[PDB]
Design an enzyme around this catalytic site. Structure first.
Site, mmCIF file in Angstrom:
data_model
loop_
_atom_site.group_PDB
_atom_site.id
_atom_site.type_symbol
_atom_site.label_atom_id
_atom_site.label_comp_id
_atom_site.label_asym_id
_atom_site.label_seq_id
_atom_site.Cartn_x
_atom_site.Cartn_y
_atom_site.Cartn_z
ATOM 1 N N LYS A 119 0.820 -1.207 0.000
ATOM 2 C CA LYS A 119 0.000 0.000 0.000
ATOM 3 C C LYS A 119 0.854 1.258 0.000
ATOM 4 O O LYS A 119 0.600 2.190 -0.756
ATOM 5 C CB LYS A 119 -0.913 0.047 1.220
ATOM 6 C CG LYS A 119 -2.027 -0.971 1.242
ATOM 7 C CD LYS A 119 -2.992 -0.636 2.356
ATOM 8 C CE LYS A 119 -2.395 -0.863 3.745
ATOM 9 N NZ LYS A 119 -2.636 -2.227 4.236
ATOM 10 N N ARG B 242 -10.101 -0.646 7.845
ATOM 11 C CA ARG B 242 -9.690 -2.036 7.718
ATOM 12 C C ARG B 242 -10.641 -2.972 8.457
ATOM 13 O O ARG B 242 -10.308 -4.128 8.743
ATOM 14 C CB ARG B 242 -8.233 -2.259 8.129
ATOM 15 C CG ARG B 242 -7.911 -2.146 9.572
ATOM 16 C CD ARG B 242 -6.428 -1.840 9.677
ATOM 17 N NE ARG B 242 -5.557 -2.870 9.122
ATOM 18 C CZ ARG B 242 -4.370 -2.624 8.567
ATOM 19 N NH1 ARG B 242 -3.910 -1.380 8.471
ATOM 20 N NH2 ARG B 242 -3.629 -3.628 8.146
ATOM 21 N N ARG C 142 11.892 -6.020 4.781
ATOM 22 C CA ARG C 142 11.616 -4.602 4.685
ATOM 23 C C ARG C 142 12.491 -3.764 5.581
ATOM 24 O O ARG C 142 12.867 -4.187 6.665
ATOM 25 C CB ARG C 142 10.146 -4.299 5.028
ATOM 26 C CG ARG C 142 9.882 -2.796 5.100
ATOM 27 C CD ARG C 142 8.392 -2.482 5.047
ATOM 28 N NE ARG C 142 7.685 -2.906 6.257
ATOM 29 C CZ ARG C 142 6.433 -2.536 6.519
ATOM 30 N NH1 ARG C 142 5.772 -1.776 5.655
ATOM 31 N NH2 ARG C 142 5.825 -2.927 7.625
ATOM 32 N N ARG D 295 10.968 -2.258 11.090
ATOM 33 C CA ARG D 295 9.814 -1.862 11.890
ATOM 34 C C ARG D 295 9.606 -2.886 12.995
ATOM 35 O O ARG D 295 9.750 -4.092 12.777
ATOM 36 C CB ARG D 295 8.557 -1.733 11.009
ATOM 37 C CG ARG D 295 7.765 -0.434 11.286
ATOM 38 C CD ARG D 295 6.671 -0.181 10.259
ATOM 39 N NE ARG D 295 5.562 -1.110 10.457
ATOM 40 C CZ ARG D 295 4.481 -1.157 9.693
ATOM 41 N NH1 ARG D 295 4.347 -0.325 8.666
ATOM 42 N NH2 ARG D 295 3.538 -2.043 9.957
ATOM 43 N N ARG E 69 -0.606 -10.304 12.677
ATOM 44 C CA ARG E 69 -1.141 -9.296 11.770
ATOM 45 C C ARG E 69 -1.852 -9.935 10.599
ATOM 46 O O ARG E 69 -2.928 -9.482 10.185
ATOM 47 C CB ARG E 69 -0.014 -8.384 11.259
ATOM 48 C CG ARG E 69 0.504 -7.431 12.326
ATOM 49 C CD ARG E 69 1.866 -6.880 11.926
ATOM 50 N NE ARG E 69 1.774 -6.084 10.705
ATOM 51 C CZ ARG E 69 2.830 -5.691 10.000
ATOM 52 N NH1 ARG E 69 4.054 -6.034 10.397
ATOM 53 N NH2 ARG E 69 2.667 -4.966 8.905
HETATM 54 N N1 LIG Z 1 5.460 -4.803 -5.999
HETATM 55 C C1 LIG Z 1 6.353 -5.181 -5.057
HETATM 56 N N2 LIG Z 1 7.178 -6.269 -5.255
HETATM 57 C C2 LIG Z 1 8.089 -6.688 -4.340
HETATM 58 N N3 LIG Z 1 8.232 -6.043 -3.161
HETATM 59 C C3 LIG Z 1 7.467 -4.957 -2.869
HETATM 60 C C4 LIG Z 1 6.530 -4.522 -3.811
HETATM 61 N N4 LIG Z 1 5.877 -3.452 -3.357
HETATM 62 C C5 LIG Z 1 6.406 -3.235 -2.143
HETATM 63 N N5 LIG Z 1 7.356 -4.130 -1.842
HETATM 64 C C6 LIG Z 1 8.175 -4.259 -0.621
HETATM 65 O O1 LIG Z 1 7.359 -4.926 0.358
HETATM 66 C C7 LIG Z 1 7.546 -4.375 1.666
HETATM 67 C C8 LIG Z 1 6.206 -3.870 2.169
HETATM 68 O O2 LIG Z 1 5.740 -2.801 1.296
HETATM 69 P P1 LIG Z 1 4.939 -1.523 1.809
HETATM 70 O O3 LIG Z 1 4.617 -0.630 0.650
HETATM 71 O O4 LIG Z 1 5.675 -0.983 2.994
HETATM 72 O O5 LIG Z 1 3.627 -2.231 2.316
HETATM 73 P P2 LIG Z 1 2.314 -1.903 3.110
HETATM 74 O O6 LIG Z 1 1.211 -2.511 2.412
HETATM 75 O O7 LIG Z 1 2.344 -0.436 3.154
HETATM 76 O O8 LIG Z 1 2.638 -2.651 4.412
HETATM 77 P P3 LIG Z 1 2.332 -2.278 5.867
HETATM 78 O O9 LIG Z 1 3.039 -3.144 6.807
HETATM 79 O O10 LIG Z 1 2.863 -0.946 6.059
HETATM 80 O O11 LIG Z 1 0.814 -2.349 6.055
HETATM 81 P P4 LIG Z 1 -0.052 -2.657 7.266
HETATM 82 O O12 LIG Z 1 -1.457 -2.516 6.877
HETATM 83 O O13 LIG Z 1 0.238 -4.029 7.686
HETATM 84 O O14 LIG Z 1 0.252 -1.867 8.516
HETATM 85 P P5 LIG Z 1 0.064 -0.388 8.856
HETATM 86 O O15 LIG Z 1 1.247 0.471 8.927
HETATM 87 O O16 LIG Z 1 -1.018 0.238 8.063
HETATM 88 O O17 LIG Z 1 -0.528 -0.577 10.360
HETATM 89 C C9 LIG Z 1 0.384 -1.026 11.427
HETATM 90 C C10 LIG Z 1 -0.455 -1.321 12.671
HETATM 91 O O18 LIG Z 1 -1.171 -0.130 13.022
HETATM 92 C C11 LIG Z 1 -2.480 -0.419 13.546
HETATM 93 N N6 LIG Z 1 -3.473 0.146 12.593
HETATM 94 C C12 LIG Z 1 -3.217 0.811 11.426
HETATM 95 N N7 LIG Z 1 -4.373 1.167 10.851
HETATM 96 C C13 LIG Z 1 -5.330 0.727 11.655
HETATM 97 C C14 LIG Z 1 -6.721 0.851 11.496
HETATM 98 N N8 LIG Z 1 -7.345 1.457 10.472
HETATM 99 N N9 LIG Z 1 -7.499 0.291 12.492
HETATM 100 C C15 LIG Z 1 -6.978 -0.351 13.577
HETATM 101 N N10 LIG Z 1 -5.627 -0.459 13.710
HETATM 102 C C16 LIG Z 1 -4.791 0.064 12.778
HETATM 103 C C17 LIG Z 1 -2.552 -1.937 13.588
HETATM 104 O O19 LIG Z 1 -2.058 -2.416 14.857
HETATM 105 C C18 LIG Z 1 -1.564 -2.361 12.488
HETATM 106 O O20 LIG Z 1 -1.069 -3.666 12.574
HETATM 107 C C19 LIG Z 1 8.607 -3.285 1.496
HETATM 108 O O21 LIG Z 1 9.866 -3.827 1.936
HETATM 109 C C20 LIG Z 1 8.565 -2.958 -0.005
HETATM 110 O O22 LIG Z 1 9.827 -2.503 -0.451
HETATM 111 MG MG LIG Z 2 2.396 1.202 5.005
#
Ligand SMILES: Nc1ncnc2c1ncn2[C@@H]1O[C@H](COP(=O)(O)OP(=O)(O)OP(=O)(O)OP(=O)(O)OP(=O)(O)OC[C@H]2O[C@@H](n3cnc4c(N)ncnc43)[C@H](O)[C@@H]2O)[C@@H](O)[C@H]1O
Ligand SMILES: [Mg+2]
Ligand SMILES: [Zn+2]
Length: 216
Positions: A13, A88, A127, A160, A171
């Site tokens: 994302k 989500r 990552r 992270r 997760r």
């Molecule tokens: N095409 C491709 N091919 C190969 N490699 C690639 C690629 N594209 C990218 N990559 C690589 O892949 C890796 C990942 O890519 P990256 O682009 O970083 O991925 P992402 O989808 O952004 O991954 P996240 O871990 O950041 O998402 P998330 O939803 O799990 O957690 P979030 O921060 O929102 O949330 C964290 C925590 O916050 C809390 N939280 C956040 N939002 C909420 C909500 N709305 N409600 C309740 N709790 C919440 C929860 O506890 C949650 O667990 C990188 O190393 C990148 O280089």
């Molecule tokens: Mg992210």
């Protein structure tokens, strides 16, 4: 342009969202980033969220909906926005619907970045995140020009806290349970668009650009 990005942990994302914001200039709103900024600044919000985040559990809907409602009310959002990681849960989606009527900015698309659950662990354990701007790299899939530092600002890259194997398992479990309900919710609304995110970053972005090119 009113957009929402959804996908399983590590689907990409953030990687795709950064590309969208550079082409359209809309604010990139990630609840995860907001929570980590709160923890870094040691705020009450950070203290509240940390417990869930460290476990890989969802932060409660009430506080999460609250910070998003406030955030979307900012002036930098009167020209559109990109929500990332929110909503989500079905409850957060229903709340967002209400909020957007208020600010008069209904969703154009909910882009679902689909990647096989079985390859996400590797996406996350490899990552590295910039301690300065939050952008992400991958040791194999998208390495920084120079090891240990961000291409953009020279900040140190780190792993992270919740990207450890144990937490990623939680997760994946927690969000997979929420996935079908959210898809059904937006499919019915007609905002949903699934994109295969298990390909080169550019191929994925090309498909996304295609979709956004259809909006006025
Ligand atoms: N095409 C491709 N091919 C190969 N490699 C690639 C690629 N594209 C990218 N990559 C690589 O892949 C890796 C990942 O890519 P990256 O682009 O970083 O991925 P992402 O989808 O952004 O991954 P996240 O871990 O950041 O998402 P998330 O939803 O799990 O957690 P979030 O921060 O929102 O949330 C964290 C925590 O916050 C809390 N939280 C956040 N939002 C909420 C909500 N709305 N409600 C309740 N709790 C919440 C929860 O506890 C949650 O667990 C990188 O190393 C990148 O280089
Ligand atoms: Mg992210
Ligand atoms: Zn950086």
């Amino acid at each position: 342009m009113n957009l929402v990005l959804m996908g399983l942990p590590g689907a990409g994302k953030g990687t795709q969202g950064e590309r969208i914001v550079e082409d359209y200039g809309i604010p990139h709103i990630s609840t995860g980033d907001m929570f980590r900024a709160a923890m870094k600044e040691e705020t009450p919000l950070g203290l509240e969220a940390k417990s869930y985040i460290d476990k890989g559990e969802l932060v409660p809907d009430e506080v999460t909906i609250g910070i998003v409602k406030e955030r979307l009310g900012k002036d930098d959002c009167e020209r559109g926005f990109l929500l990332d990681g929110f909503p989500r849960t079905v409850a957060q989606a229903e709340a967002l619907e209400e909020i957007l009527e208020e600010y008069g900015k209904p969703i154009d698309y909910v882009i679902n970045i689909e990647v096989d659950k079985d390859v996400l662990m590797e996406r996350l354990t490899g990552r590295r995140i910039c301690s300065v701007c939050g952008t992400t790299y991958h040791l194999v899939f998208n390495p920084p020009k120079t090891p240990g530092i961000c291409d953009k600002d020279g900040g140190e890259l780190y792993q992270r806290a919740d990207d450890n194997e144990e937490t990623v398992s939680k997760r994946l479990e927690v969000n997979m349970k929420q996935t079908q309900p959210l898809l059904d919710f937006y499919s019915e609304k007609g905002y949903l668009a699934n994109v295969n995110g298990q390909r080169d970053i550019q191929d994925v972005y090309a498909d996304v650009k295609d979709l956004l090119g259809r909006l006025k």
